[PDB]
Design a protein around this nucleic acid. Structure first.
Ligand SMILES: O=C(O)CNC(=O)C(=O)O
Ligand SMILES: O=C(O)CNC(=O)C(=O)O
Ligand SMILES: [Mn+2]
Ligand SMILES: [Mn+2]
Lengths: 402, 395
DNA sequence: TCTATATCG
DNA sequence: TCTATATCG
């Protein structure tokens, strides 16, 4: 908060001053943050942290590899594809130029990471892996527009734009690189040991152009925050999101895996395969379709990439609904199928209420028309095309009798 | 939340129906909950979980072995002693209740060790794992409390205590709970990190008791769905009291006092200032912050706290010694405990002047002791508010 | 692998 | 061994 003694620190957390980037890059990436901001591609996420619905003070945009997603606090952010070698389409060509810029920024920081990681080993296959960023989450805020910021509760570090947390959904021991852009009373990033409360935390100053890296298991052993300054500030947090079971290819393949048991008639009713089938059904429904509809569609203002695959995933989902109706008709002795799918159906019910709630929640009505969440897939009992109804319990209670 | 097949349930958790404990015991413990309520010995705690100040919907009191304490969410509750062999209870009736909850503790302890044995299909651990040293008594009236958070995962309705873990427990320790429902109360259970598995809500009927054994408390999270009538409850548990009993803090103080110092060896001064911080923020401030309310019931802690205060004052005198003295490795060896002192000092001063801490009735208002303005002569050193650390900070 | 728990009027 | 966030700080 004052003119502090915080430079002496110790690395697993390395800091690299503005003087390390070509300045050729600075203008390009700062212009990318400015164009992205003016077109209105940065939005606040309507997270649901522990049962509570919360808007994030900072406004962000997930950019990265096409087909990749990052789930963070029950919300799954979808990547605006960046032009990775091999061609994708964006709305306006400004946004596409910026996604190009961040893509080269990603490669640059990545190089710096592998190097700093070699320097650290002095105390090889794994590293390259651990420094292979696949996404970057961009943030922005304007401290003079937030009516009230929370206040760091342990070292009187003042207001904070992002409270003590951990970066989530990352490959084990993976590093994270952050480029800070304070516009032209100073911003700082806080770091602290995760469980101790009596060890003074570190606030390291972030000036226009400074970059800081978190290496190895620092993000897991420590928690960090972002203390606010007096001017507005941008930032690109490049990460290597653990995207197994998190890419479009993965969910498509599963779908084909669940649909392999249907020639609506199913090729077999072995309780284990049906279990998987209804679980994959739930996964594509609540982990992809509802989320996208809930918050992804705002990205539609920046890219069309997700329009057709989501629709495919919706068709696939409808077919599962038809297999669900089929198995339900088969139970109209051996009730191992009954004690193999009731949990996935009741879970699908609760998750359906939870999402339905988040959608029509008090906070969710506080944002722009184009951003308000849609509760798709949704359908009233009078729809004929749908095999089953948006459940609301009559069916599970019937299955429960046994 | 209606008649269901939920009773059909599993193994590392046991419910024992009202019909298994003696009616002489139920009347005794039920009368104890009523007397404790009438005397106004149940207060809500002004916890500060993770930096935020919150009042607890349920009202509780910690009763147990003399000299024991239980830390829960940054608040340390002090035990009003229950008779075990010298007790100074303020009112006869409160002392009678603590005697009954002492026999309840023994009883539940026996059933617990039993059920722990039966679950096997050495044996000293089991006994240690079921040696309850404290009990946290709870009461609430759902009518009085209009809006109670709603269970966010299985539509189990309102909750008097959200999904959590019982903390400050010996590893692998069991917990026994006696429920007193005077529209039914339920206890929720679910796998901890698991959000797609439907949770279990077990009905709780006047006189029912449920036990949590082995890791269950660590692998799962439980809650308390509220009913329509008011309810009491005794959660007998074995706090992992080492480092949380008076004898421990007293010895540390003495340990601290063995130094007009006897030595400025960088290691011993470090540990000395650490003991200073521990006694300052983990006993004195907690007792006067949240401790003072229990004097309505018991005066046991008046005697030891005051000794802890006087002694600490002496530790302040040791600090004054070290600041006058300060090659300077006795500087890069004490900065963490003093800066920690500074922050913890703000933290407590804050909890003190918070809105919720200001709205309480006179009996429960938090006291920010030890506190003194610069003007006070007696204290060798001040209440920080920087300067010393800043001066100390250089190089 | 829950847990970044802020509509400041 | 944070994390039971139901009183605007
Ligand atoms: O921008 C920063 O300095 C820090 N941002 C984050 O920690 C994040 O987005 O996870
Ligand atoms: O009273 C009950 O059934 C549950 N109470 C608790 O979980 C508790 O106080 O830790
Ligand atoms: Mn982060
Ligand atoms: Mn509990």
């Amino acid at each position: 908060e004052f003119y502090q003694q915080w430079q002496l620190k110790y690395p697993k957390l390395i800091l690299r001053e503005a003087s390390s980037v070509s300045e050729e890059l600075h203008k390009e990436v700062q212009e990318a943050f400015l164009t992205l901001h003016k077109h209105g591609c940065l939005f606040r996420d309507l997270v649901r942290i522990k049962g509570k619905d919360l808007l994030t003070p900072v406004s962000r945009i997930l950019i990265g590899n096409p087909g990749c997603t990052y789930k963070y606090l029950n919300t799954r952010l979808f990547t605006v594809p960046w032009p990775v070698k091999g061609n994708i389409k964006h709305t306006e060509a400004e946004i596409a130029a910026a996604c190009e810029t961040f893509l080269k920024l990603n490669d640059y920081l990545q190089i710096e990471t592998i190097q700093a990681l070699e320097e650290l080993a002095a105390k090889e296959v794994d590293i390259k892996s651990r420094a292979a960023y696949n996404v970057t989450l961009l943030n922005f805020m304007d401290p003079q527009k937030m009516p009230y910021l929370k206040e760091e509760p342990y070292f009187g570090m003042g207001k904070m734009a992002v409270s003590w947390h951990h970066d989530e959904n990352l490959v084990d021991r993976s590093a994270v690189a952050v480029y800070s852009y304070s516009c032209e009373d100073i911003w700082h990033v806080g770091f602290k040991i995760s469980w101790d409360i009596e060890t003074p935390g570190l606030a390291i100053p972030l000036h226009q152009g400074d970059c800081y890296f978190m290496l190895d298991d620092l993000n897991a052993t420590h928690k960090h925050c972002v203390l606010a300054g007096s001017q507005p500030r941008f930032s690109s947090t490049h990460r290597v999101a653990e995207c197994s079971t998190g890419t479009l290819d993965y969910i498509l393949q599963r779908c084909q895996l669940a649909l392999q048991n249907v020639c609506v008639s199913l090729k077999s009713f072995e309780p284990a395969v049906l279990k998987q089938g209804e679980e994959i059904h739930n996964e594509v429904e609540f982990e992809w379709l509802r989320q996208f509809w809930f918050q992804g569609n705002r990205y539609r203002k920046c890219t069309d990439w997700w329009c057709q695959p989501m629709a495919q995933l919706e068709a696939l989902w409808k077919k599962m609904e038809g297999v669900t109706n089929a198995v339900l008709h088969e139970v109209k002795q051996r009730n191992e199928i009954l004690t193999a799918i009731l949990a996935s159906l009741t879970a699908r019910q609760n998750l359906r209420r939870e999402w339905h709630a988040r959608c029509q929640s008090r906070i969710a009505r506080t944002l722009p028309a184009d951003q308000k969440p849609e509760c798709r897939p949704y359908w009233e009992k009078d729809d004929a095309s749908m095999p089953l109804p948006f459940d609301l319990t009559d069916i599970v209670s019937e299955l429960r009798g046994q």
